[PDB]
Amino acid sequence: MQIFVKTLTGKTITLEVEPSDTIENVKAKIQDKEGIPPDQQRLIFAGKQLEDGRTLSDYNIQKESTLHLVLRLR
Amino acid sequence: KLELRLKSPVGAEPAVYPWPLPVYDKHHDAAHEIIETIRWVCEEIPDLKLAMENYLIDYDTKSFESMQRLCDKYNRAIDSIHQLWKGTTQPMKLNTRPSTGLLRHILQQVYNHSVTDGETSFDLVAQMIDEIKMTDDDLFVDLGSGVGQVVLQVAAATNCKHHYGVEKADIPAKYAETMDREFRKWMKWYGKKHAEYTLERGDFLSEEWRERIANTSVIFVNNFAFGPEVDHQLKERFANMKEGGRIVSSKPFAPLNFRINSRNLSDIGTIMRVVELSPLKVSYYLHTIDRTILENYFSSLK
Amino acid sequence: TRKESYAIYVYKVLKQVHPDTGISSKAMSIMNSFVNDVFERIAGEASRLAHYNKRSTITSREIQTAVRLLLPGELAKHAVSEGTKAVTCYTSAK
Amino acid sequence: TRKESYAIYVYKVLKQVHPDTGISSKAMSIMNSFVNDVFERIAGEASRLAHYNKRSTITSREIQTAVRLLLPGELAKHAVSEGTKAVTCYTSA
Amino acid sequence: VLRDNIQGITKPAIRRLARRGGVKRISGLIYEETRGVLKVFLENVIRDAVTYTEHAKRKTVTAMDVVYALKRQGRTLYGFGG
Amino acid sequence: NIQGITKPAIRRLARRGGVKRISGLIYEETRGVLKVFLENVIRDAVTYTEHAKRKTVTAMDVVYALKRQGRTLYGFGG
Amino acid sequence: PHRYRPGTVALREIRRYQKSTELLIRKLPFQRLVREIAQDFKTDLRFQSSAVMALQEASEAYLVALFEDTNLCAIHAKRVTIMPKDIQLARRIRGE
Amino acid sequence: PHRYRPGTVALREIRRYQKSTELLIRKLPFQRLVREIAQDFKTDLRFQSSAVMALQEASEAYLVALFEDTNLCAIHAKRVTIMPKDIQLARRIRGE
Amino acid sequence: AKTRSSRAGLQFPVGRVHRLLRKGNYAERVGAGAPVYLAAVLEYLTAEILELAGNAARDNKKTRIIPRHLQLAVRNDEELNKLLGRVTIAQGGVLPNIQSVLLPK
Amino acid sequence: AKTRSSRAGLQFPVGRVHRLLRKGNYAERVGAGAPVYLAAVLEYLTAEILELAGNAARDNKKTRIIPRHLQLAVRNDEELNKLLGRVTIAQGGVLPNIQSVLLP
DNA sequence: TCGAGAATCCCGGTGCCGAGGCCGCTCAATTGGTCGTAGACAGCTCTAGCACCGCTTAAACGCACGTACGCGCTGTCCCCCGCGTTTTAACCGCCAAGGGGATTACTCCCTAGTCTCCAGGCACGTGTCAGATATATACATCCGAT
DNA sequence: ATCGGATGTATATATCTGACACGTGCCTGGAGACTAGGGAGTAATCCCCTTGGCGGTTAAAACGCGGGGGACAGCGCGTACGTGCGTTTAAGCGGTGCTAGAGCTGTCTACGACCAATTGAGCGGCCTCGGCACCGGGATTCTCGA
């Protein structure tokens, strides 16, 4: 299924995913598309800091979602 | 003993000056504050300046009688103005913000009253006000506020929701407590508005202060002598600030000719623009959080 | 014979500050000898801190006060910063 | 504790050029630092000769071609003559 | 605290030094530059001296470290045991 | 023998530094300073040659010799 | 009255001060200066006497050599009096 | 016909030789001079190419620096042309 | 086996620097922490010079760094000039510079 | 037992020079002839400078060499001046020298 | 004030040889322990650095006052730049003979390391004269009236 | 130029003190005999590389002439600086109190030389293709004579 990841510049990027995928492999796909290293990224949804070692189905992220990505530094 | 009394124009507590006048420094005494106070109030009120024109005079600051005479003339004029306001004349509009000359005079008055025995000058702060224009969304904190006069000037000149000052050293924080009270007292005396403020003691590097700094939109920090350890911790705490926040400091946190590459990825410079502030007719530097630059750099690598 | 150099590391570090440039042979050997000169000067001012304080082991404490002697100010402060952030990472080995 | 000087050898070698003259306490330390400076500079150009030719033993030949490098000319020629006589008495007896 | 001790170098002192050099006459705009040159020289050497001081945790400068730090710049100097 | 370093040559080398006008006596002094400089560097170079039992100078030996007169040199190894 | 022509008293100073070998700058302001710049680089050092005397000797050496170079520099321009242009011309040749 | 005011073409060639990079003295007599002065320290040596080119580079830069200093000291005395006492002064200051 | 470089997160070869120090006869011993710090300092300096050199190369509209650009890069930067104050970079030339008084009136 | 110094006919302490040479990491090994040669070179140089100093000392009618005489001796001899060209001898003063153009 | 020509810069096609990517390949970086001396550290004796103070007097200092002198200006003349023409050798490519630079086994003989023996350099204390200070006086030197 | 006055400079004379030579008791670093072992001295080889020489363009080097801009001597002016005298000031010299910190020995423990095996990280060697070196047509810049 498709979800959207809205960053802070007005650009929306997309991906087709399944709820059983880990957050790490989503980050790897984003790294494949935009080149941004996973460890610098910080995905946030509904005020809670989304952890890496859970699954996509753990945060109830469904098809047609608006997810916020802020960038952090090491 | 001998006493001088000036009535408040809004019927607040009178301003009291002891005789003999306390010495402030080699070039400053209380008579100077008194004469500038009279001059600036006459500036505040054209009617008072009119009244004071009729009987300018050679003030002899050495003689008590001469000063008591002028003070009597002033107090009677204050009386007559209150009668004028009882008549048809519109009284002075209350709780407007003071003019620039008034803000320098009030801050000078609190200063002269407080430092009985380094400080950023009023003019640089005023330049800073001129160039970073604050609105009602912004929240300002001087980390290491010294005697607090930057915080007071901004609190007196803008309409932010709240201002804070934090001072570590006991003596200036102590004087700042008196500064707060003397400012509020004189402010009641002149009947002028400023926004709300509190100067608190504490260490801004604590865990608690992390969320406050994180939620602060404008930081001023005179970090020139802090050293690498404090500066390092400050970089780390600025790195949590919200989009569009601004930090003005006296020593840049990133070099002016910064270019993002794959080697400089952890320098604070990747998330901020830096421009050097115009000199006043020493140097201070504005950093603005703009994360679109990193995104741009990544889009260009593809 | 297998004549050593300092070429390929200069080559690798150049790609991390510029995405795509080229470096020619004469200037590559220039960078080679420049690295060799900075190395010999720093090691000299290191080893003079042996006999000026009656110890006989050059330690990780020593090269720091070596390097802040030789280069001037801004480069010195960034040098010592890069050095201490380098050494604090090496001790956290699994 | 004790600290080695180069005092008594300067004071001894004074006697073989002047029977009369004397030396002062600051002056003896000045000569001390002079011979110590010549020592470290000559050994420096000694040890730099090894790695420029991958040898590993500082020898007589090494320091001999070192001394003609450092002093300018005439004093060096007198130095190398005093040396090339000075090796002979050590291999004499 | 201490302030402005650069004015301890007097005008007749610098005149006497320039006598040792070999000028005859000095003009009235040398004293500022002369004080500045003395300040930058003492700044360089004394900073390197305190660096050699604080290397080995001795909180006081000795003369031998001053001799070493003068030898770093190439202005070596006998007469004190260096 | 010295007269290969001709007049427009030394003018060109002076142009690099940034004179404009040169007068009719600089040439002998320039030849002299070049002679003394080359004499010192060549003596030190052939001494570093003669020490290690070779008979031919090399670039490494020339740059080792030029290290100790305070004008060190990059770009040729060592 | 009695008077000298201007110039020869300075030459008497040349012929006197060159023969003598004593220090020139009086000691206590020099020690004050070293303590001040040491205060600026670090908090609260202490100094032994021999280091202060050594610094003074080297300082007088530096100043006397630069002054003799400036005197040659000023002689080059048909003038016999030093000037700030002359001390600066003497400075950008040593490599500062 | 047509001419130029004297010195301006020299200014254009100042810019021209400051722009480019190449060597200055033509190579073969320079090799001749370095073969002759090498005769009086050991007879019958033989030279490699790279050492000759390196000696050329160093002597190049040395003459460049000496001329730049002597131009500056020539400017100091309000004269705009070098003369032998200027190159002597700039040599005698430096420490030869 | 993991290389010392990867553990320290550095690009310059730590191991080779260790080897050169032992045989360079600088001291009887060389501590474990000693070789990493020096390598990091050498790395930072290389990056600094190459950064300014690349920018200088760019300005002449060329993509390959040649020695003139390396020479030009150090002298226009105040701080680097002192480190190489007695160094001449071969095939380098000089900085564009004409004395003001020499310009036509 | 006879000292190493006597066999070489030198005054400077060969043995002490050997000890100082080994300790200091100048080389892995130290040959038998090296400390003797170095000692002899130091002896010749010390005698030369002290010799000229003593000669300089006599003219001022003093029997004890003080720093001034040592300073005067080195700088008036052309060859020695280059070796200590970057050296300052403490309590030395300078050589008498007045520029000709400055005389009345 | 301003046009003619000498030079200087933008444009585009051609042609290459040095960058750089890949591959087979050896030997320096790494792991894993054993062991030992250099260093980190805690506790003492004692020294020299610091702060203060009472007191001479040499030296820092401020001002009158005359004058050698830095500086602008004019004027002369001389020597040096530009440019055209003519003589030189720089140099680029080409060839060919051999001198020593780099290297590889081979050994041998010089040199770190060790143990015992012991006598030369060091702190200490003691006498004694060399040179610093004072002084009267012989005389070189500098200005000044003439 | 001329002597003559005056002020500094140099020579021999007493005295008086604190640095300089010498003797002693003393330890600890230098000397002698001896193993063992590897770094260095010497012989061969092979082959890269240095030197020597020859023919052609031609770029650069030498040479005379015209003239112009700057090197350089003199002149007048006023400004800034040496010199000397009376006033102020803090520099220097002695004496003491003290104490933070320089320096030395003891104990031990964490850290760094040393060694067998492992192996991939780094380097010679070979293809290849593209940045840039060169070139000629036009589009802009600079300087000067009226």
Which of B232, B290, B301 minimizes the C-alpha distance to B266? Answer: B232
Per DSSP, what are the bridge partners of residue B161?
none
What's the 3-state SS for B80-109? HHHHHHHCCCCCCCCCCCCCHHHHHHHHHH
The token duo for B226 is 């802090």
Which value, in Å, is the radius of gyration of the alpha carbons in chain D? 16
Contact check, Cβ <8 Å, A71/B292: no
Q: Are B187 and B11 in contact (CB under 8 A)?
A: no
Inter-chain Cβ pairs, chain A and chain B, closer than 8 A: 31
B134 with B222, same domain: the answer is yes
**What is the structure's resolution, reported in angstroms to one decimal?**
3.9
Q: Are F16 and H47 in contact (CB under 8 A)?
A: no
Q: Are G88 and H93 in contact (CB under 8 A)?
A: no
The token duo for B105 is 């005079």
B95 with B133, same domain: the answer is no
Number of CB atoms found within 10 A of residue J58's CB: 14
- Number of structural domains chain F divides into: 1
CA H90, CA I14: separation in Å to the nearest integer?
Answer: 46
**Chain H nearest CA to F1, separation (Å):** 6
**CATH 1.10.510.10 given to domain G1-96:** no
Tokens 């003063």 -> residue: J93
Per DSSP, what are the bridge partners of residue C23?
I65
The count of C-alpha atoms lying within 13 angstroms of the C-alpha of G37, restricted to the half-sphere facing its C-beta, is 19
Report all structural domains of chain J as residue ranges with CATH numbers, in order of start. 1-104 (1.10.20.10)
**Closest CB to J42 among D35, D57, D59:** D35
| I27 touching chain J per CB within 8 A | yes
Distance of CA A35 to the CA centre of its chain: 14
Question: Is there contact between G15 and strand L, defined as CB under 7 Å from any strand atom?
Answer: yes
Query: Quick one: closest CA in I to J27, which residue?
Result: I25
- Distance (Å) of CA H64 to CA E63, F10, H93: 41, 10, 17
Angle at B74 between CA B70 and CA B77, to 5 degrees: 140
String of DSSP letters for chain J: ---HHHHHT-SS-HHHHHHHHHTTTS-SEE-SSHHHHHHHHHHHHHHHHHHHHHHHHHTTT-SEE-HHHHHHHHHTSHHHHHHTTT-B-TT--------GGG--
Angle at C23 between CA C21 and CA C28, to 5 degrees: 150
Inter-chain Cβ pairs, chain B and chain C, closer than 8 A: 11
Q: Are A15 and A26 in contact (CB under 8 A)?
A: yes
CA G65, CA J93: separation in Å to the nearest integer?
Answer: 11
Measured between its terminal Cα atoms, the distance across chain D in Å is 37
The count of C-alpha atoms lying within 13 angstroms of the C-alpha of B93, restricted to the half-sphere facing its C-beta, is 3
String of DSSP letters for chain H: -----TTHHHHHHHHHHHH-----S-HHHHHHHHHHGGGGTSSS-B--HHHHHHHHHHHHHHHHHHHHHHHHHHHHTT--SB-HHHHHHHHHHHT-
- Judge if the upstream peptide bond of residue B20 is cis by omega within 30 degrees of 0: yes
CA B227, CA B144: separation in Å to the nearest integer?
Answer: 14
Tell me the three state secondary structure of residue F5: coil
Q: Can you give the CATH number for the domain in which E76 is found? A: 1.10.20.10
The token duo for H54 is 């390196």
Q: Which of J25, J28, J86 to mutate to test the interface with I (most CBs of I within 10 A)?
A: J25
CA B6, CA B15: separation in Å to the nearest integer?
Answer: 5
Tokens 């360089």 -> residue: E44
- Name F66's Cβ contacts closer than 8 Å, sequence gap at least 6: F41, F44, F45, F72, F73, H58
Tell me the three state secondary structure of residue C91: coil
Query: What's the CA dihedral at H34, H37, H43, H49 to 10 degrees?
Result: -10
For chain G, the structural domain boundaries read: 1-96
Which value, in Å, is the radius of gyration of the alpha carbons in chain E? 16
Contact check, Cβ <8 Å, J24/C47: no
Domain span at residue B203?
122-302
Helices and strands in chain B: count of H runs, count of E runs: 10, 11
Which of J49, G66, F4 minimizes the C-alpha distance to E17? Answer: G66
B196 with B209, same domain: the answer is yes
Q: Can you give the CATH number for the domain in which B285 is found? A: 3.40.50.150
Is J100 buried (19+), middle (13-18) or exposed (0-12) by CB count in 10 A? Answer: exposed
The token duo for B159 is 């309409």
Q: Are C36 and C11 in contact (CB under 8 A)?
A: no
Distance in Å from K37's C1' to C14's CA comes to 44
Fold classification of C1-94 (topology level): Histone, subunit A (1.10.20)
Considering only residues 57-76 of chain J, list those whose CB is below 7 Å from strand K: 62-64, 66
CA B234, CA B213: separation in Å to the nearest integer?
Answer: 10
Tokens 């190159």 -> residue: H87
**Chain D nearest CA to F31, separation (Å):** 22
Which is the CATH superfamily of the domain at D1-93?
A: Histone, subunit A (1.10.20.10)
Q: What are the backbone dihedrals phi and psi of residue B70, each rounded to the nearest 5 degrees, phi first?
A: -65, -40
CA F53, CA B23: separation in Å to the nearest integer?
Answer: 88
Which value, in Å, is the radius of gyration of the alpha carbons in chain B? 24
The token duo for H60 is 């190049």
Contact check, Cβ <8 Å, G11/J91: no
Query: Quick one: closest CA in I to H19, which residue?
Result: I96
Method used to solve the structure: cryo-EM
Which value, in Å, is the radius of gyration of the alpha carbons in chain G? 18
Query: Quick one: closest CA in C to J25, which residue?
Result: C47
Contact check, Cβ <8 Å, C17/B261: yes
Number of CB atoms found within 10 A of residue B246's CB: 18
Q: Express the helix, strand and coil content of chain E in percent, nearest 5 each.
A: 60, 5, 35
Strands A66-71 and B163-167: unpaired
